[PDB]
Structure formats: C-alpha cells, structure tokens
C-alpha cells in the first residue's frame, strides 16, 4: 500500500498503512473492549503502542499505574524473581510468544483474551486483619478496582511461574494456558481458583 | 492532698446518698459520683431514615425517639471515653464542653 521510496528500504509490511498502530505489528488495539464497566479506566488498551516496552515514569505519582499499558504491566510483572529480576527484554519476548500462542488457540484476538482473563481473575471482595490479637479473625471488605487489576495480574503471573517451574512447558506456553483458562471461568486455572477461594473465604467472614 | 475541693462527690450537706449501679460494670457507686449521660436518640438512625420513610404506611410517621439516662461508673467513664482527664487549671470548668453544635 503505497511503498514510499527511500535510500534506506524499510520493509513493506513496516510501511504498508502505518496509521493503524498494532502492538507487535500483529494485533489491533481497536476491536478490543472491556466487558466489565468497573475495571474500565484501569486497563489501558485505549492508547496504541508499537512495543510492550516503554521507559515511562509510571511510579512517580499515586495513580499513574493505571495509565501504563496493560500488556506492559503484564511484562513488568513477569520479571519477578531474584534469578531473573532486571531482565525485561526476555519478558517482552515471553509476552510476545504468549500472544502468538493465544492467537493460535481460539484466535479471539489475544488482547481481548488478556483483558477478559484480567477481568475474570480479579477478586471482587476480600478480607483484612481486624482481630485484636486474642480474638483475631479476617474481616470482609471490598477491593479497589485498581487493586483488582493488580491482583489479577499478580495471580496470573504467579500461576504461570509455578506452572513453568521444573516443567517441560515454556513460560510463554504456561502463561498462554493460564490466560486462556482465565478468559473463561475454567476452575482449572490457578488464578481463577485463588480468586474463587478468596471470595469464598471473604463470604465466610462477613 | 485535696485534688478536688468538691471531692468529686458533689454532696456538700447530705452525709449519705443512695448508690446506683454502673451500666457497664455494675459498680455500686453513689448517685452523685455516678456520672450521668442522657442518651436521647432516634430509634432509627439517619442511615435508615430514607428506607423507613419509603417503606412505611402512615405517611409522615412521627418516627418516635428513644430516651435513656445512663448511670456509668467512674472507671468505665474514664475507659469508655465518656469523661477525660483534664489539666489541673481546666478542672475548674464545670460547664459542658461548649455546645457540640449550634
């Protein structure tokens, strides 16, 4: 589509119609919408990005964490252990591989799968420590939608991590399985299982 | 030494008054050293006034109040936050704490 001539020949696919910014030049941010109304404005699929890698000051003020691209937040939460703590290009590669794998299984543009899994795997009611030592219990309270996004990302990455640990499957494949299972309500997913159990426990301690 | 010229009792000319019991700890304490608080409140709080008004027959019910004079002891009164320790130059003042709201 109108290949611009230059002394340096950028590939045609990189030149085709680039007013249509894609995540990895593969997935469209349009067609992706948030089903839940509570967690909108805390999932940042609205802005376009050419890479899930941006050196953004997303930890200076209080609430800029929401404005970070959701895929970028997933990448940042993947790089979580002492053995692999600063490595983020590896996290970007893992997320990219997960996105292609999710595209393979039930095409369902993988950004929508990511969003739906994050919506489903976030708890809606939690507990806090209120017991005065001798009479110590848990106490049922509600969760902030930002903390819902944070917690959903957290359990998704934890489940992928302990699925990949000393296992044949790669981290990308385990993350893709967890995301696919959390797209639906399949209890086989670890994140959705923790969500269900935590909500049940909060129900038990009204 | 005298911490209180009134001795806290507020008796001054009786010798003996009839004691009353604490509402929390049931302390047999004289009726004048039995710091009293007249709790007058609504039988339905402001949190449920709208709900009751919408779901009640007899349009514009008077919503009657509840009255109870609480006879605390003094240890509970210190602990249950009813009465507070004061400066020795502030102990002089006996007026209630300046009209909580006008």
């Amino acid at each position: 589509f109108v290949p611009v001539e230059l002394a340096t020949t950028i590939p045609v696919e990189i030149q085709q119609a680039q007013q249509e910014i894609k995540l990895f030049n593969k997935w469209s941010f349009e067609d992706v919408e948030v089903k839940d109304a509570s967690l909108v404005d805390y999932i940042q699929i609205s802005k376009p990005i050419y890479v899930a890698h941006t050196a953004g000051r997303y930890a200076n003020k209080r609430f800029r964490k929401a404005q970070c691209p959701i895929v970028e937040r997933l990448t940042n939460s993947l790089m979580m252990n002492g053995r692999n703590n600063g490595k983020k290009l590896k996290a970007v590669r893992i997320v990219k591989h997960t996105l292609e794998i999710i595209n393979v299984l039930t095409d369902q543009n993988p950004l929508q799968v990511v969003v739906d899994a994050i919506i489903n795997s976030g708890p809606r009611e939690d507990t806090t420590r209120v017991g005065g030592g001798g009479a110590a219990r848990r106490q049922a309270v509600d969760v902030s939608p930002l903390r819902r996004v944070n917690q959903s990302i957290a359990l998704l990455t934890i489940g992928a991590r302990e699925a990949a640990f000393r296992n044949i499957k790669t981290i990308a494949e385990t993350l893709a399985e967890e995301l696919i299972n959390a797209a639906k309500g399949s209890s086989t997913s670890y994140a959705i299982k923790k969500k269900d159990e935590l909500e049940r426990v909060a129900k038990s301690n009204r | 030494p005298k911490k209180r010229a009134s001795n806290g009792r507020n008796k001054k000319g009786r010798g003996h008054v009839k004691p009353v019991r604490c509402v929390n700890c049931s302390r047999s304490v004289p009726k004048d050293k039995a710091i009293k608080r007249m709790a007058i409140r609504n039988i339905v709080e402001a949190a449920a006034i709208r709900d009751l008004s919408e779901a009640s027959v007899y349009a514009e019910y008077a919503l009657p109040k509840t009255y109870n004079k609480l006879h605390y002891c003094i240890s509970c009164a210190i602990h249950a936050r009813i009465v507070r320790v004061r400066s020795r130059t502030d102990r002089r003042i006996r007026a209630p704490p300046q009209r909580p709201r006008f």
Partner: protein, 64 residues
C-alpha cells in the same frame, strides 16, 4: 443467584482500620443515584471508581 451490583464513589471518608491500610467511602448506585451506602475498600480509591458489591444491605462500620 448472582446479585452483583455496582457503586460509584461520590466521596472518600478517610482511611480506617487497625492496619491503617483500608479506607472508607460513600458509594452511590449506578441505578437510583439518590440511594447511597457507606462501604469499606481495601486498596487505592478516589472519586470516580466503580466498586463491585455482592451485597447491598451491608453498611460500613469503623474497623478497630
């Protein structure tokens, strides 16, 4: 059933709890916007969020 309801905060009534990590807000329903509750949140909130509640009769009581 699944009586999941939504509630948009109109004001935040400080932060409560022995931990000091929970907050208290005044939420108003997406429906019938003249009907409000006071509710406890465990996480960062501000004027504009939409909490998800599995209850509606509950009212927040200060945690001590």
């Amino acid at each position: 059933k699944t009586p999941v309801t939504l509630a948009k905060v109109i004001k935040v009534l400080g932060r409560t709890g022995s931990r000091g990590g929970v907050t208290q807000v005044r939420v108003e329903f997406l429906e019938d916007t003249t009907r409000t509750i006071v509710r406890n949140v465990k996480g960062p909130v501000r004027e504009g969020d939409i909490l998800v509640l599995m209850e509606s009769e509950r009212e927040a009581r200060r945690l001590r």
